[PDB]
Design an enzyme around this catalytic site. Structure first.
Site, PDB file in Angstrom:
ATOM      1  N   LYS A 139     101.714  15.344 101.042  1.00 51.19           N
ATOM      2  CA  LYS A 139     101.927  16.574 101.538  1.00 51.19           C
ATOM      3  C   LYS A 139     103.281  16.351 101.532  1.00 51.19           C
ATOM      4  O   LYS A 139     103.542  14.983 102.284  1.00 51.19           O
ATOM      5  CB  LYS A 139     100.876  16.749 102.618  1.00 51.19           C
ATOM      6  N   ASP A 177      94.260  25.939 113.297  1.00 58.18           N
ATOM      7  CA  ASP A 177      93.783  26.462 111.791  1.00 58.18           C
ATOM      8  C   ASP A 177      92.835  26.935 111.042  1.00 58.18           C
ATOM      9  O   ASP A 177      92.937  25.960 109.768  1.00 58.18           O
ATOM     10  CB  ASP A 177      94.643  26.541 110.993  1.00 58.18           C
TER      11      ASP A 177
END
Lengths: 5, 292
Positions: B52, B142
Site C-alpha cells: 500500500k 469503513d
C-alpha cells in the site's frame, strides 16, 4: 461512488 | 501542516530503509481511499507481497496514516490482513503487507449471486475479526465489500484500516465524520458520539450488498443517500423474497437505528443464521479466476 470521505 | 515536518514524524515510527531493495516488478492492482495498492515480487524467494503506497500530500487528515502503524504493531488476527513492515519512501508511506490474491468481495457482489452459505461464511469471518477488534477498543469505520479481501482458498480477511479509531474508558466515543456515504451508520451521519456499533450497521449494509449487489440509495448522490440514512427508516432489501427468514432476522439485529439496540459482534456470533456458514472452500467458485 464507492469512495471514502 | 508542514509536509516535511510530517515526513520526519513518520520516519520515527516506520521501519528503516527502502523495500525496493528487496522487491521487484511493482504492478498496480487497486486504488483505495488513502492511496494505491501494488503487487510486488520478493526477489530472494519469488513470493508475492502487497504494497500500500500513500502520499502524505494527498491525505485529507494526514494523522490517520498513523492508524496503519498502530494496527500493524498491536492487532494481528486470523481474519485481519497481516502487515509486515512500513517505510518512508520519499513523500509516500509504504506498507508491505500480505497479498490477498483472491481480490476484494466487491468484485464478487457486483458480478455474481451469493447463496446464504457463502453470505453466512463471510459474515461469520467478519464478525470474528470485529469481535476481537471491538473488545480491544478498535473501530474499523469503513466496513464495506471493498474492505473485505479473499485468499485463493476462500479465506476472508479485513483490510483498509486507514480510517480506524480507538475508544477506551477515557475516550468512550468517537465523533469524526468518517467512512463511505452509503455504508455510514445513522448516528454517525447525525454527528452523534458513537462507538463500535457503527461497524455493525456498516456490516448490515454489506449484507445488502451481497443480496442486492449494491448498497441502498446507491443511485442517489452521496449526500442525498446520507440524509435518507439519517432521517428514514432502516433501508430495506430490494429482494426480500430472496432471503431466508433466518437471514432477514439476522439483518434486523444489524440495521437497528438505535445503536444501544443494535446487536454487538459478540452477540451476533451466536445468531442461528451463522450456522449456515460454509467453509472457505465454498467462496472459491465465486472468484473471478473460477467463475464462467
Amino acid at each position: 461512488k464507492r469512495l471514502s470521505v | 501542516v508542514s509536509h516535511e515536518q510530517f515526513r520526519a514524524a513518520l520516519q520515527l515510527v516506520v521501519d528503516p530503509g527502502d523495500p525496493r531493495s528487496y522487491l521487484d516488478n511493482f504492478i498496480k492492482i487497486g486504488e483505495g481511499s488513502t492511496g494505491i495498492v501494488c503487487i510486488a515480487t520478493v526477489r530472494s524467494s519469488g513470493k508475492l507481497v502487497a504494497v500500500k503506497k500513500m502520499d502524505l500530500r494527498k491525505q485529507q487528515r494526514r494523522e490517520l496514516l498513523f492508524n496503519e502503524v498502530v494496527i500493524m504493531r498491536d492487532y494481528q488476527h486470523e481474519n485481519v490482513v497481516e502487515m509486515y513492515n512500513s517505510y518512508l519512501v520519499g513523500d509516500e508511506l509504504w506498507v508491505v503487507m500480505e497479498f490477498l490474491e483472491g481480490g476484494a468481495l466487491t468484485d464478487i457482489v457486483t458480478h455474481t449471486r451469493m447463496n446464504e452459505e457463502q453470505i453466512a461464511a463471510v459474515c461469520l469471518a467478519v464478525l470474528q475479526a470485529l469481535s476481537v477488534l471491538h473488545a480491544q477498543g478498535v473501530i474499523h469505520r469503513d466496513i464495506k465489500s471493498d474492505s473485505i479481501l479473499l485468499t485463493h482458498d476462500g479465506r476472508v480477511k479485513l483490510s483498509d484500516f486507514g480510517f480506524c479509531a480507538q475508544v477506551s474508558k477515557e475516550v468512550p466515543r468517537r465523533k469524526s465524520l468518517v467512512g463511505t456515504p452509503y455504508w455510514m451508520a445513522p448516528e454517525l451521519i447525525s454527528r452523534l458520539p458513537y462507538g463500535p456499533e457503527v461497524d455493525i450497521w456498516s456490516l448490515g449494509i454489506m449484507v445488502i450488498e451481497m443480496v442486492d449487489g449494491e448498497p441502498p440509495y446507491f443511485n442517489e448522490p452521496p449526500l442525498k443517500a446520507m440524509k435518507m440514512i439519517r432521517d428514514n427508516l432502516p433501508p430495506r432489501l430490494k429482494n426480500l423474497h430472496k432471503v431466508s427468514p433466518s437471514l432477514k432476522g439476522f439483518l434486523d439485529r444489524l440495521l437497528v437505528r438505535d445503536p444501544a439496540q443494535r446487536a454487538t459482534a459478540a452477540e451476533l456470533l451466536k445468531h442461528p443464521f451463522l450456522a449456515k456458514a460454509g467453509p472457505p472452500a465454498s467462496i472459491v467458485p465465486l472468484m473471478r479466476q473460477n467463475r464462467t
